[PDB]
Symmetry: none
Subunit: 53 residues, 6 copies
C-alpha cells in the first residue's frame, strides 16, 4: 500500500519479473487502466499476474 | 543463465520503446525467439520491431 | 501517439538505442524543451534522431 | 567484476519492487549475500523477498 | 540544481551508485521526505550519502 | 558484443546521474573511450565524471 511509480517501462519490467517463464503481454490500448493505476496509484504484484501469458 | 535473464530485462524495455502504442507479447519461450536472436547478437531497433504487435 | 513517460534517464536510454554507433548528446540547458515533451507529452523516435552525433 | 556490478543494479531494482513498503538493506558485503546467490543463479521474486526487511 | 526525476526505483539505483561497497538502505516509511524531494525537486549526490550503510 | 551494448546502457544512465545539469556527449566511438575503460573495470562516479561536459 505504497505507490511504486510503476510508470512507463517500469510496468513492463515488473511484468517481466512477476511472470517469469510464462512471459507477459503489454497492450497500451487494452491496458490503459492498469497503466494509469500502477503509475499514479497502487497495484499489487498479484494483480499484475493477470497480464502473464 | 543470469546473463540471459538480465539481457531479457533490457529487451522488454527496448520493446516498450519501439513498439509504442502497438505493444507486444513477450515470449522468451518462442522458438527462434527474441532472446536467441538478440541476446546472442546486438539487435537494432528495426530488428526489435519485428517482435511488436 | 501515446505518451511513453520518457522522463529523466529514460530519454538518455532512448537516445542510446536510437542513435546506435553514432552516439548522442544530452545537454539539459539546451534540451529543456524535448526533455519536457518526451516526459509529459509525445515525442517520436524520428524526432529523437536530432540529438544523435 | 563489471558483470557483478551490473547484476547488482538489476537486483536493487527487483528488491525495490518486491519489498514494497518494507524496504530493504542492501549489503553486497553480506556473507552468503544476495550477489553470491542471485548473480550466480536466477533468483525468483520469492527468493529475492528473503532479502527484504 | 536541475531535477533529475529520481522517482521510484531510480532513487535506489542512485543510492547503489553513490554508496558503492558500503551499500545503502531503502526504507519507504522513514524516507518519505527524500523520496518526494528527489522525485519532484532536487537532491544532491552528497545528500544521498546519508543513506549509505 | 551484447554485453558491451548492455554495459553501455548502464553507463549512459550513470552519466545522466553524475553529470547533472552539465550533461554529456556519449561517444562509444571515442579512442580510449568510456566503454573501453568502464566496461572492462568498474568505474566509480568520480571516474565517470571525467566524461561529463
Ligand atoms: O536494445 C537491445 C537490448 C538487449 C539486447 C539487444 O540485442 C538490443
Ligand atoms: O530479478 C533478478 C535480477 C538480478 C538477478 C536475479 O537473479 C534476479
Ligand atoms: O556505474 C557503472 C555502470 C557501468 C559500468 C561501470 O563501470 C560503472
Ligand atoms: Cl546487464
Ligand atoms: Zn531503468
Ligand atoms: Zn517516472
Ligand atoms: Zn523511470
Ligand atoms: Zn543490465
Amino acid at each position: 500500500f505504497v505507490n511504486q511509480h510503476l510508470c512507463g517501462s517500469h510496468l513492463v519490467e515488473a511484468l517481466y519479473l512477476v511472470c517469469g517463464e510464462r512471459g507477459f503481454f503489454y497492450t497500451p490500448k487494452a491496458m490503459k487502466g492498469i497503466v494509469e493505476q500502477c503509475c499514479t496509484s497502487i497495484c499489487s504484484l498479484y494483480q499484475l499476474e493477470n497480464y502473464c501469458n
